[PDB]
Each structure stands twice: as C-alpha cells, then as structure tokens.
Design a protein around this ligand. Structure first.
Ligand code: HEM
Ligand code: HEM
Ligand SMILES: CC(=N)NCc1cccc(CN)c1
Ligand SMILES: CC(=N)NCc1cccc(CN)c1
Ligand SMILES: C[As](C)(=O)[O-]
Ligand SMILES: C[As](C)(=O)[O-]
Ligand SMILES: [Zn+2]
Lengths: 414, 416
C-alpha cells in the first residue's frame, strides 16, 4: 500500500504515505513503466468550450478549500464552513467559481511544492505572487510581465515569482503566452537546414516574424513576446533591453573562452505551463526563480540539438576529439559548467551549482517526510545531467505521483 | 494513433511505438497512481525461496509459453515437432512436477534472458554468449571447477568473452545450488575498530561470512575474496581462486604521473553470481554470467560512490582542487580523471573495456535493431544512462519503456 523508499548511500528507509492522497493518474501501469516520457499521452488538458461536471469541479474545490483552511489552522472554523458554502453556491449557479487572493497565493506555493520534476523546492515557501486576474488585454499582459521581470531580476539578486493571469472559462478562448519562456534566444533556419541561434526556438522565432517581427541575425537575439487575449490573434511586444539581464560567459583560467562570445540570460521564466488550483485552471501563469548551472552549461549549451558547443570548446582545449575514450566531451562539459558558475558569480547574479542544489533537495525531502509523510519526486529530472552519481539524490529512491494544486503541460495555442 | 506506448527521442525528434510490451506477462511495481521505477529492489520479480512445489498449472503455462518462444525462434511454430515437445513437457510435469530443457532450449533461453534485461546497456552483444551447460554438477567442489573454467574462458588473457555457466535448476524438495558471493571476483571489506572499513564497504557481510567459514583474512584494500559455494542441502564450502586466474589491472593516469602511486586497481572480469535465471518457469538459482566492463562501473561507481571506495576527495586533493566549495566542481573534475585513468589503464593492459560514450551509442543501435526485430525493447532509463556525463550521451535523450519479459534474470534472496 505504502512504498518503502530506500537511500542506498546511507541505508536509511522511509515509507511514502502521501502518495495515497493522489487523485490524478500517471502514465504507468503494472504492465509497464513510462516514467521516462516527458509529456503525457492523454494526461493533457482538453479544451474548455463546455463547463466541467459540477460534481467533479465541486469535489476538487472542496478539497482545495479544505487544504487552505488547514494551512492557516482554521479547519472547521466558521470561516471555513462559510467559504465552502460560497464555492458551493457559485458552482451550482454559474458552473465555476473564483479564488480569494489569499487562497491563490497558497495555491501557487503548493503547486510548486508538489512539482515532482523541480530540484529547487526547498524554496517553495518563498514565492512572490502577482495577481493579474484583473487583466483584460494583451497590452496589459505585457505590462504585468515587464513588472514581473523587473521584480524577479532585482538587478541580479533574483527573487522567485509568479504572475497569474485570468483563469480559463467555458466556451471562451484562453489567455496565453505563446513563448515557452519570457526570455528566449531566436533560432533562424538557414540555407542548408542548419540553424543560427537556439535550434529549440525555430518555430517560435518564425511565428514572431510571421506576426510582424523584424528578425535579427545573431546567435543570442532575445525574442519578442507573442501574447494572446481570449479569442484574439496574438500581439507582438518587444522587451525593453534594459529589463533583460544577461551574463557574458568567460572562464576562470582559460583566457580564450571569452572569445567564444557566449552568453546567457539571468532569468529562467517558464511561461507555457498551466497552473491548476482547486479545479480552476490558469492557462497563463509565468513563474521564475534562478538557474541551476547545469541547465545552461550542460543542457542549453551542450545538448546536440541545442547550441552544441562541445566540440568547439574541446578543440580550443586542444583535446583529442578523435576518440570517445579520451573523454574529451566530459572534460569540455566540466569547463563549460565552470565558466557558467564563474561568470554568474562574477556578474553577481544568483545561481546554484548542481551539488549545492541536490544537497538542499535532500534536506527538502527530509522536511517533507516529517511535514507530509512523503514527497513526489521524478528521479530522472532531479538527478543532474552531468555527474549524476556524484550527487546525493542519485542514491535516493523516489516515488513519483500527482498532487494538486499542480503545474501541468498544455497544448501549444497554435 | 497506435494504441501502444509512444516513445520519443528528443534529440532526433523521431517517434516509435512499443508493441513488445504487449507480450509482458509479469507485472512491475508501477500503477496509474504512482511510479516506482526508481526503486532498485521492488518486491516484484523477487524470487523468494518457494519450498513447496510450484502450481503445476502456473508452471505449465510458463513452460508452454517458453516452448512457443523457442519454436518461434527456429521458425517451426505450429509444426508437429512443436506440438510433440509441448506434449512432452506437459507429460513430464504430470509425472514429476517439473520438466527439463533440451540443450538448445537452454542456450536460447539464456540469450533471451540477457536480451530481455532492462537494466543492461550492453545488450547489443546479446547474440554472442558462450553458454556452459553445467546441469550435471553434483558437488560444491565441482562447482568450483566449472567456475574456474568459466573464468579462464571468459578472461581469455584480456580479450574478454561473454559467458554464462548454468548449474542445476531448483528442484522440488531439494536444496538450491548457490554461489554466496554476489560476484566471482570481489574485494574484501574489513570493518575497523574506529568503525570505518578497509577495502570495499559493499562486501563487509560476505567478508565476515568467509571468515566465519574458516577464511584467514588479509588486511589490504584489494584482497580478492574466496568463494562460498553451496551444493543442495549442504553447508557452503570455501574455495580460494588461484591468483593466476584473477586478472587485475593496476590503475595509472595518462598524464598525471602521481596517480599510479595511489596503488589503486580493479579486476578485469565482471561476473555477477547471485542472480536467478528463470526460463519457462524453471529456476536456475546458480547461473553466474559475465561480459566486460563499461568504464563508469569502475571509475565512477566502484571508486567514487560515497559508500564504496569513496576516493573523490583523495584524488581532488592530489589535483590540488578546492574541496571546500561545491562551485569549484572538484568532484566533477576528479571523477573525470579517475574514469580516464581506468580506460587508459585497461587499454594499456590490453584488457577489454568500453567507455560510456561508445557503450550508449551501441545501445542506441541495439534499440533500433530491436524495434525492427520485436517492436520494442524493455529499458530502465536510470540504469541505462551513465552515472557521469548523462546528457552528453545519446541515451539520455531517448525515452524508454520498462517492462518484464521472460526468460529473465531476477533478484533472489541471500542464502544465509
Ligand atoms: C528558485 C530556484 C529554482 C531552481 C534552481 C529550480 C530548478 C529546476 C530545475 C533544474 C528543473 C528541471 C529543468 C529541466 O530539466 O528542464 C525544474 C523544473 C521545474 N520547476 Fe523549478 N526551480 C526553481 C524555481 C521554481 C519556481 C519558482 C517554480 C514555480 C513557482 C518552479 C517550478 C518548476 C516546475 C513545475 C518544474 C517542472 C517543469 C516541467 O515539468 O517541465 N521552479 N526546476
Ligand atoms: C558485454 C558486456 C556487457 C556490458 C558492457 C554490460 C554492462 C552493464 C552495465 C553497466 C550494467 C549496470 C551495472 C550497474 O549499474 O550495476 C549492466 C547490468 C546488467 N547486465 Fe549487462 N553488460 C554486459 C554483459 C552482460 C551479460 C553477458 C549478461 C548476461 C548474460 C548481462 C546481464 C545484465 C543484467 C541482468 C543486468 C542487471 C542486473 C541488476 O539488476 O543489478 N550483461 N550491464
Ligand atoms: C527556474 C529554473 N531554474 N528552471 C525551470 C525550467 C526552465 C526551463 C524548462 C523547464 C523548467
Ligand atoms: C558485465 C557488466 N559490465 N556489468 C554487469 C554488472 C556488474 C556488477 C553488478 C551488477 C551488474
Ligand atoms: C578559442 As579557440 C577558437
Ligand atoms: C598527488 As597525491 C597528493
Ligand atoms: Zn513507472
């Protein structure tokens, strides 16, 4: 019934009783495990042209409201009962309801806390929540986003934040941020099918040009935002350069590294995920924190389908790229990650290396074991892309399941 | 689209569908409610010592399935020979409660068990396996003879060859044939007075057991342990492998001249000996198998794990790195040089070994061969992706479906 979770480095064991609280199904079954799949096959988020079953929504809303009053130690109180009646009354008459700002803040922090793929959850309690539900146009969306960015960047002393735009509504279009992140580098397809810039942003880069953007021709051209108000074509907005903090990359001892002209933005702000609280869905709720160095140094810069700079760096390090056994890729990867850490640290911009991050996550696991009797975690995403076993989480067994409030993937708006 | 798991490779953007999972007849530890795919030992395949004979009804369905697999493999499914073998197996089980495999069936089954192993990245070599039939073995002493021959053949003075020796299957009522050691070659772990361990911390229990059985312990960091071999219904017997038969490689670094002074070393032959081989319901409690090493097993796991030799700090200090701060990536730097030393040394000693890049690339080829040959390949992502440089290898970006197919290698409880 309850999974026996073991840590192989310390020989310690714990039981996850929290997983019993899961109400949403994952992709696995006794016949086969599909935990390595990035996106769901069916756990997607189908349209909302029609109102969701009142009974279903109501049970989800009740659970959430129950969670909320439990957090403020007022479960069973008069306020708790009166709130349930309000939600009850509104759903029965309108088919939906609305959250009080206090509940929204609690819900956003809980969704982060429940995110199985995030290694930085020790920070879950520290999140600035901007209520943008009073937004009625793409222009206003742009203003909220600029304020979010300014606040979150804080001149290099990054502060986690989330801005919540209006919830989805039946038979009405969704408020959406087309870009997958608030700050992305353009990806331009060139003559021979190759790509200049970030190969992962080719499609979005094209949509931007398609919608009137005058494209650049560099390797790190910050993309403009395509923001969409309900049932309207997306509108193009260019982010004020002074709002986009970037860090020039250089190496602590390799004088030539800087000559590579590499750089990366300071703010990691996912903008394409859906936030679900008490059955309510927020199709546009950009969130941000700070980077873990491997995200930039290993994945963004070294992935084969990304900037793929491994060989360039290897050649500059005069390594033997003639064979795999020389481990030239491993050596280059380490120096690139070192350059990222050194540079962000030099530019006084918040960043965390994969060792510090995993160590804090182990602490989080312990805190959660005491607080809730478990912690949903997705091993493949918690263990860093390099030096996996050199970190504590590698040797820690984990249980993965879905708790709500939650952040979920949703279909591309186009 | 197709009603089977959709598997994607995020590097190539290609998609495939796994239809082979449809053939699994054994459940794993996951459910729609939660994924337990990271658990090393989930009480699923766990072949607990089942004293009372197995349900003749359950044994037969498993046996029939295996025979169908075997006849399918030789392209004679539905033939008269197929139906006759099926009748022979059912008859044998009827009058004895069990049955026996023909020589070729055992060979086929051993290879399929390796082929079906979700956690093995070396499966592109699956078709090349020397299967030693030792089902005539009747004593612990004879087990030692078979094991020594296996070691000699497999080691082949450095030009390693994959092999498996199969001892008698579990029999109703009679005790099991067992090799107490988890591997044929292991280094002793000696508990110290201060509580620390000299040697391999992973082998403290087995080391103590060997001592308790008359072994006179050494006091080194790399003392090869003796074998505790157990024949049916007899206490385990102790056997010391002749040094000349255990090929080892002293570790040195290609450029860091001082690394050789560390006195580190590792043995050439990775031979797992505590796993159970299951074929058509029959259980081979003693069926040690071996291939060759993938460098990270030695350089990253065995030498750098916190609970193993834990040499990361020593090497970093030798490289004069800043071990007082994580952002210096001293752990990452030292791990890289330790792995390079392993590859370098094995290559120098002319002992077969494969680096994690070459291995994962060959596994990708294996996945493609298997997609065409069986419509899928059971794979455990966490075990397939190397412990270092994960995303620098192609397997990291490949989604994988994990499920249990039989014949298979399963975990079994310790004999003691
Ligand atoms: C403050 C420091 C933070 C750090 C260092 C951190 C780090 C990470 C990392 C490394 C990943 C995996 C990235 C990948 O492989 O693509 C991740 C995923 C995630 N993080 Fe965090 N995180 C932080 C803040 C946040 C915040 C503030 C939120 C939300 C309020 C959040 C929500 C998530 C979610 C939902 C995922 C999984 C997304 C997916 O499934 O694609 N994180 N985080
Ligand atoms: C040809 C060379 C081979 C290589 C390079 C290779 C490599 C590996 C590696 C790296 C692992 C995971 C090690 C760990 O994390 O503990 C593994 C696991 C495994 N391999 Fe292979 N392997 C090879 C040959 C074999 C052979 C010949 C067999 C059997 C006939 C085999 C059966 C397995 C099994 C069953 C496991 C999983 C055991 C467990 O769950 O602990 N391998 N292999
Ligand atoms: C906040 C952070 N470091 N990482 C979150 C994230 C960024 C890009 C893709 C998926 C998650
Ligand atoms: C043959 C090989 N390289 N690896 C298999 C293995 C070795 C030690 C422990 C478990 C599996
Ligand atoms: C620095 As080199 C090209
Ligand atoms: C090199 As030693 C200290
Ligand atoms: Zn699973």
């Amino acid at each position: 019934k309850f999974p026996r979770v073991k840590n192989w480095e310390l020989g310690s064991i714990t039981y996850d009783t929290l997983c019993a609280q899961s109400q949403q199904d994952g992709p696995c079954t006794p016949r086969r495990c599909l935990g390595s799949l990035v996106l769901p096959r069916k756990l997607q988020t189908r349209p909302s042209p029609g109102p969701p079953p009142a009974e279903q929504l109501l049970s989800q809303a009740r659970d959430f409201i129950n969670q909320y009053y439990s957090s403020i130690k007022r479960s069973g109180s008069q306020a708790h009962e009166e709130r349930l009646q309000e939600v009850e009354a509104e759903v029965a008459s309108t088919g939906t309801y609305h959250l009080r700002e206090s509940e929204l803040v609690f819900g956003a922090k809980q969704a982060w806390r429940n995110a199985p793929r995030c290694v930085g959850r020790i920070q879950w309690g520290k999140l600035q929540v901007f209520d943008a539900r009073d937004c009625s146009s793409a222009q206003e969306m742009f203003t909220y986003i600029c304020n979010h960015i300014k606040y979150a960047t804080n001149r290099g002393n990054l502060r986690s934040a989330i801005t919540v735009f209006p919830q989805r509504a039946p038979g009405r279009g969704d408020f959406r941020i087309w870009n997958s992140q608030l700050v992305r580098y353009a990806g331009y397809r060139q003559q021979d099918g190759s790509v200049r810039g970030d190969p992962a942003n080719v499609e979005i880069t094209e949509l931007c040009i398609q919608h009137g953007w005058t494209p650049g021709n560099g390797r790190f051209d910050v993309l403009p935002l395509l923001l969409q108000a309900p049932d309207e074509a997306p509108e193009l907005f260019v982010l004020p350069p002074e709002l986009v903090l970037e860090v020039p990359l250089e190496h602590p001892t390799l004088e030539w590294f800087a000559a590579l002209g590499l750089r990366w933005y300071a703010l990691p702000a996912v903008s394409n995920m859906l936030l679900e609280i008490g059955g309510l869905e927020f199709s546009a709720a950009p969130f941000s924190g700070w980077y873990m160095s491997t995200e930039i140094g290993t994945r963004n810069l070294c992935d084969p389908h990304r900037y793929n700079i491994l060989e360039d760096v290897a050649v500059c390090m005069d390594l033997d790229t003639r064979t795999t056994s020389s481990l030239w890729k491993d050596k280059a990867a380490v120096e690139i990650n070192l350059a990222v850490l050194h540079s962000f640290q030099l530019a006084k911009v918040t960043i965390v290396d994969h060792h510090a991050a995993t160590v804090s996550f182990m602490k989080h696991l312990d805190n959660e074991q005491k607080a809730r009797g478990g912690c949903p975690a997705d091993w493949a995403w918690i263990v860093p892309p390099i030096s996996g076993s050199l970190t504590p989480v590698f040797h820690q067994e984990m249980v993965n399941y879905i708790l709500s409030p939650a952040f979920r993937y949703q279909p591309d708006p186009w």
